[PDB]
Structure formats: structure tokens, C-alpha cells
């Protein structure tokens, strides 16, 4: 048995040597030359009130105007970002929701949490009222992130250390992704829908193949649990957030620690990470009751977003990049631009 | 400025907001409770007793007061990242069986560690903890069969039921690092039908009284 451990250690050492070999220069050296981005000023254009409980997750629709927010009050609310009107208020069977997402087609919306069930809701029912289409149960751990791969298939991350791709009509997990030493929390979809990356408490980020059903790449370097992860707009890189108060950017091709964002006066963890449309601005939520803008290239604090009285749990940038939403445990959603 | 049915959409938004506010007001009066403990600590038997794969919710109605009990024992996953969602729980019911010394993989040390972890958790500083010690009826003779020294080496009192239970509950209470912020209730429930309900009602009403005094300025 010890031979297997020795082989694994040798393989890890070879991987590390390969990582070091291609580290000719650090991103800071190349990015020092570009002009710095000036202080980015943003204001609370809209304060989407209406929730009476904590906010954990949100998602922007492909139309870049409608968004859905999940709260522990037991209601999923679809908001009109321009008029703030309440499009829908879906009564959840289980109030302990932890994540939600909006279908790219806009005809579906899903959420889940401690109930261990991925509920799929129809937003264009002939009946008129939103109803659950199919309860995609089967996970043995609390759901932590759900993203719609396509209008008829989704990918789910749960606390049972497994990520499963669910077929809507069939009601079964067609593909199962395993290999995480700890519970997997966050998950992001690549722009091409070909790859997705997830992070777990094992302080490692895993890249998986959508159709091959096998692991592709693994990343390490975080000193604590991973909480947030999102793809770079080009899709060839992604930034990951951890409870160690540091945000790190990894490139799939480079396959090594590219750049780490951190400040001395920041000690809280990171709950949500998102990228701007151009990718120059990195937006990450922090538990100190405000969000800080990080320059994706120069790693400088380009700005600070504040106004929430509690931890910011979710944030997302519209597909057009016009505005970025922020959600916190105080039951308030703020749109910035 | 609004169009013909933009006003209609605004009216629908107001209707949805009114319905959501009514539902939230209705739910606020309802009491929320969290049930923690080992699987073999009589959680299922006890929850079934007082009834009037993921998280399980139960509803009770006692003396015109609504209850919400949350069972998360079946959730076999790492804590400290999903427990924080229960920050609003009025009180935590911590069920421990007095008869679990004889099993070693020792459950008493695990239960003490769990109590230390949740009671001292930063998210539950102001919450009240109710200790329902079950399996008293068979503990009555289990204590006779084996002494508490099998699990508590520092124990030196008489090997009596009344003294053994007192020492056990004192030890459980001692784990609380903050005496003033929170109070830990202790009760022996199993083998009874209404006393457990009465104790839960007393604990919840005491918590409400404390909250009223605190927001009145007396705490």
C-alpha cells in the first residue's frame, strides 16, 4: 500500500516542479507597466427592498435586466432591475434555501439548500402561477450552488463532496463528478459551456469536463476553505475566493498560481467573486459589510462598495456589464453602476 | 410617465409585496427551534413523543403558540458554514442520552465536544440552549451496573442516581464559556408525554420575556 503513497507523492512533486519550471515571470512584473485604473465611483442606483430575511444567492438573467434572489423567508423574488417591480414571488416548499440561478432561456429558475433537493420552477406556465416542474433530488448533502448548463440540463454542487449534472426531463443525474476531499461549495460555468470549475473546503479548485464526465485539472494554494469562484470573461482563467481573506486568480492554460489579491487591513473571508465584462475589474464580496473592487491585472484596490449593514453573500455583474448587484444578510439588494 | 400596463405591473408588485409582508408577519410570531444531538440520543423517539434525507421540519401547536422545529441530524456534512443560517433560532434543543458511556469506537465525550462547539459558537451567543437528557429509565440501572468513573475519571461522589444526574448536568452546564449572555436549561424528558412540552413552552416563554425586557432596556 505504501507504494501507492510514494507514487502519489512523487507525482505531486513532479506536478510542482512543472508548475515552477514555467514560472518565468509573475503577473505583477508584466502588469506593472499598464496605466492604473482610477478610483471607480459607484452609487446605489436601486435599493431592491422587499425581503424580510437573509439573502444568500442571486443571479442575472441573459437579458441583463431581470434577476432572482433567494432568501430564508421562503420566497424567490424575480426583480425588474430598471423599475424594481416584483415580477414573481415563488413560495418555496423548504425555506432553507442556499443558492439560486436563472435559466439562460429565461423559462426556468432553480434553487436549493439544506433540503437536499434541487427545485426547478417554471416561469412561463400556462396555469399562470409559477409551479415546481421536477424535484431533482438524490444528493446526500446540502446544495451549495446551482447553475443552468442549458435550458434542459443543469449542474449542481452539494455538501456531499460531489457535483452532479442533472437532466431535467429524465429526473436523474446523468453524470457524477467526484474527487473533492471536502464539501464543494461554489461552481462557475465557462463561457463556452464546455468546462466548469468548483471549489471545496479542501482548499483546492477542480476543473471538470461537462461531457467527458472526468476531472481535468486541479488547483491548490488557498490557506482555508474556498467559498466563491467565477470564470474570467474570456473563459481561460478564473478567480477563487477563500475564508483566509485572500482572492487568487488561476489561469487554466498556465495551470499555476497567477496572482493573489490581499491587503493587510482585510481579515474577513470572501463569500462571492465575480468578473466584469472586460475582465479588468474583479469584484469580491467580504464579510466586513462591504465589497472591495480589485484590479484583475495590477491587483490594486480600485474601489470600495459599501452600504450594507451585514455580510454581503452574493453579487453578480450583468451580461452587458452595465451594473453589478450586491446582496447581504440584511435583506437588501443594491445595484451599482 | 408610466405606460398603460406599467402601472398595472406596479400594482401587481404592490400586491405581491403586501402578500409577502403578510406571510412574513405570520411567520415571525411562529417560534423557531433547532434540534441537535446524536442519532442514538433518542432524537427520533423524542420528537415523535411530543408530536401534538435532508433537513426535517415539524410543526407543533401548544397553548395557542406556534412552533417550528428543525432537525438537521441527518445532514452529515461539515459544520461552521451552514449552521450560521440558524442565527435567528429562538432556542436550541440539545438531546443527549445518559446511557452512551458503554460504547467506544465514548459518545459522552463526543456530546460534550458538540455542546462546546455549538453553545460557544459565535452565531449562537444570545440563543438559549435546552438540554433534554433522555434514557433516564434505563440509565437508572445502567448507573448501577457501571460507575461514572468509566467515563468521568474525576468523579468522586456517591454512585447514586440523584447524585449522578446532578454531576452530569453540572458538567454539561460547565462547558458554557459565557454564563451571563446565555442560559442552559436542563430537563429529563424521556418516559413522559406532556412534561417535555411544558418545559419547551416554559423555555420559549422565558426567552420571549427576556427579549422583551432587553428591548425594553432592562437587559
Amino acid at each position, epitope marked *: 500500500l505504501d507504494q501507492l503513497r510514494q507514487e502519489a507523492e512523487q507525482l505531486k512533486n513532479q506536478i510542482r516542479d512543472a508548475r515552477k519550471a514555467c514560472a518565468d515571470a509573475t503577473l505583477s512584473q508584466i502588469t506593472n507597466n499598464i496605466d492604473p485604473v482610477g478610483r471607480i465611483q459607484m452609487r446605489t442606483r436601486r435599493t431592491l427592498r422587499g425581503h424580510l430575511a437573509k439573502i444568500y444567492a442571486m443571479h442575472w438573467g441573459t437579458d441583463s435586466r431581470l434577476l432572482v434572489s433567494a432568501s430564508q423567508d421562503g420566497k424567490l423574488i424575480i426583480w425588474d432591475s430598471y423599475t424594481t417591480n416584483k415580477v414573481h414571488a415563488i413560495p418555496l416548499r423548504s425555506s432553507w434555501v442556499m443558492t439560486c440561478a436563472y435559466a439562460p432561456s*429565461g423559462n426556468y429558475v432553480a434553487c436549493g439548500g439544506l433540503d437536499n433537493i434541487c427545485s426547478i420552477y417554471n416561469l412561463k406556465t400556462r396555469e*399562470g*402561477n409559477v409551479r415546481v416542474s421536477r424535484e431533482l433530488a438524490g444528493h446526500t448533502g446540502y446544495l451549495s450552488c446551482c447553475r443552468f448548463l442549458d435550458d434542459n440540463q443543469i449542474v449542481t454542487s452539494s455538501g456531499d463532496t460531489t457535483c452532479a449534472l442533472w437532466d431535467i426531463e429524465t429526473g436523474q443525474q446523468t453524470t457524477t463528478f467526484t474527487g473533492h476531499t471536502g464539501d464543494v461549495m461554489s461552481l462557475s460555468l465557462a463561457p463556452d459551456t464546455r468546462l466548469f470549475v468548483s471549489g471545496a473546503c479542501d482548499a483546492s479548485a477542480k476543473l471538470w469536463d461537462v461531457r467527458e464526465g472526468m476531472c481535468r485539472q486541479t488547483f491548490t494554494g488557498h490557506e482555508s476553505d474556498i467559498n466563491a469562484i467565477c470564470f474570467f470573461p474570456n473563459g481561460n482563467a478564473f478567480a477563487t475566493g477563500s475564508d483566509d481573506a485572500t482572492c487568487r486568480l488561476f489561469d487554466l492554460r498556465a495551470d499555476q498560481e497567477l496572482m493573489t489579491y490581499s491587503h493587510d487591513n482585510i481579515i474577513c473571508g470572501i463569500t462571492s467573486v465575480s468578473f466584469s465584462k472586460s475582465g479588468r475589474l474583479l469584484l469580491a464580496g467580504y464579510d466586513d459589510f462591504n465589497c472591495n473592487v480589485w484590479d484583475a491585472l495590477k491587483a490594486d484596490r480600485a474601489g470600495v462598495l459599501a452600504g450594507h449593514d451585514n455580510r454581503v453573500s452574493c453579487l453578480g455583474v450583468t451580461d452587458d456589464g452595465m451594473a453589478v448587484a450586491t446582496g447581504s444578510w440584511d435583506s437588501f439588494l443594491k445595484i451599482w453602476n | 410617465t408610466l*405606460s398603460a400596463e406599467d402601472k*398595472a*405591473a406596479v*400594482e*401587481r408588485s*404592490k400586491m405581491i409585496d403586501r402578500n409577502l409582508r403578510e406571510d412574513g408577519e405570520k411567520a415571525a410570531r411562529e417560534v423557531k427551534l433547532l434540534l441537535l444531538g446524536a442519532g442514538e440520543s433518542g432524537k427520533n423517539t423524542i420528537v415523535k413523543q411530543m408530536k401534538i434525507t435532508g433537513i426535517v421540519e415539524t410543526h407543533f401547536t401548544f397553548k395557542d403558540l406556534h412552533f417550528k422545529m428543525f432537525d438537521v441530524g441527518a445532514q452529515r456534512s461539515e459544520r461552521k458554514k451552514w449552521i450560521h443560517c440558524f442565527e435567528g433560532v429562538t432556542a436550541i434543543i440539545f438531546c443527549v442520552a445518559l446511557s452512551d458511556y458503554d460504547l467506544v469506537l465514548n459518545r459522552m465525550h463526543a456530546s460534550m465536544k458538540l455542546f462546546d462547539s455549538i453553545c460557544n459558537n459565535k452565531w449562537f451567543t444570545d440563543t438559549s440552549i435546552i438540554l433534554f437528557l433522555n434514557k433516564k429509565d434505563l440509565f437508572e440501572e445502567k448507573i448501577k451496573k457501571s460507575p461514572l468513573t468509566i467515563c468521568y475519571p474525576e468523579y468522586a461522589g456517591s454512585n447514586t442516581y440523584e447524585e449522578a444526574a446532578a454531576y452530569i448536568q453540572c458538567q454539561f452546564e460547565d462547558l458554557n464559556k459565557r454564563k451571563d449572555t446565555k442560559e442552559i436549561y436542563t430537563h429529563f424528558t424521556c418516559s413522559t408525554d406532556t412534561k417535555n412540552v411544558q418545559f419547551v413552552f416554559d423555555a420559549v416563554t422565558d426567552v420571549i420575556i427576556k427579549n422583551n425586557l432587553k428591548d425594553c432596556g432592562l437587559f
Partner: single-chain antibody
Amino acid sequence: VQLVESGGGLVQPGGSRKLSCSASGFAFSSFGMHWVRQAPEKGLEWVAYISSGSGTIYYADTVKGRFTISRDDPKNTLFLQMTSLRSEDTAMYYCVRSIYYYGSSPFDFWGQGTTLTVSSSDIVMTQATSSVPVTPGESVSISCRSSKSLLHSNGNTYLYWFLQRPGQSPQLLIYRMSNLASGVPDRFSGSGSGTAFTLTISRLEAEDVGVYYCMQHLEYPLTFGAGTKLEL
């Protein structure tokens, strides 16, 4: 989805009646209702509108006061108490289903209708031709014009197109002048500009024969065009 309305018959001039519309198969408690009437040989005409939960109610200038609209969500029924009738009120009455929100399809469903015969600033809709011959496999363009531009400052053009097969209830074809209604064959395609609009049909075939109704929903009272009857 089904809408059943009844309460027709012969009414002497100056009489009263109580029409009803039964709602089933949909969340009537949250959906608004409209009443649109069609004369025995003329086009449609808006009657009344009741919002969700009876929050807001509107009536046409030619029917204000004469009729009152009420609904009972627990009974899933819509009521239209009517009195002081005259010969001008003799017309088919249609129960209309509508929900108002972004991406919604108002006026997407229409009831069968009830026959009620009486014993013997508003926007004006204009249509190019009353009837135009058609042939299967061809394309026909129908043009509709409004007194004022229907493009609101928000960027949405408020045009609704309805088709009524001979003897059947009308159905919604194009809403907002750019989006296809649910369940349509997809042959239709709407386009237009400020005060000018047109409806294009690709590969006209059977079951498309009927009268096309032009509607505006920028400001009440709602008005309807004279209709354009396609004939084979």
C-alpha cells in the same frame, strides 16, 4: 385553460342583466380580466377592465356608469352587472384573460362568448383595406396606423395583433409588435415604427383565413380597428 361565460338572451330596452364568466385552469386570483364586445356585423370594442384583486377598475367612455364589473376570487367567477340597455349595446361579449408584467402576454386568451341581443381624445385605429384576397403559399402584409406614436419612452411599442377564425374566439398573434405569442405557428412576424406598423405573414396556408384586429394599449380607453378579413 377554459373560460365559460353565460347570461345572454333577449333583453328589452332599459332592462338589466347579470353576466358571469367562470375561470378555471389558471390562477384567476392573480390574473386581470377585460371585457371586449363585438357587434353582430362590426369590430371589437373594449368594455371594462378590472385589475388584480380589484385594485384598479376602468370603463370605456361609451359604457361608463351603465355597467359595473366585480369579481369573486374564492368562487373563481367574474361578474358584469348591467342595466339601462339600448340597441347600441347589442353585441357579442368576450371574457378576456390578461396578466401584466415584463415578458407577459396580455390578452393571450379569449372566451367563447355569449349572445346578448337588445330588442328593437380616444385613440382611433385606422386600417388600409377592409378585405384582401389571399392564396395559399403567398405572403400578405397588413398595415395599421395609430393617431399618436405608440413608442413609449421606455422603448416598448404597445401594439397587439389578434386573429379571429370564423365562429371561433380570437387569439393573440403578436404582442409588443416584435414578440411572437405562445402557441402561434411562428409564420407571423411583426414590425413597425412610430405611428406606422405592419404585420408580415410568411407562407400563408390553411387555417389562416380570418379577420385581423389591430389594437393599441398605450393609454385607456382601449380601442380596436375595423378588422381586415382575408378571403381565399
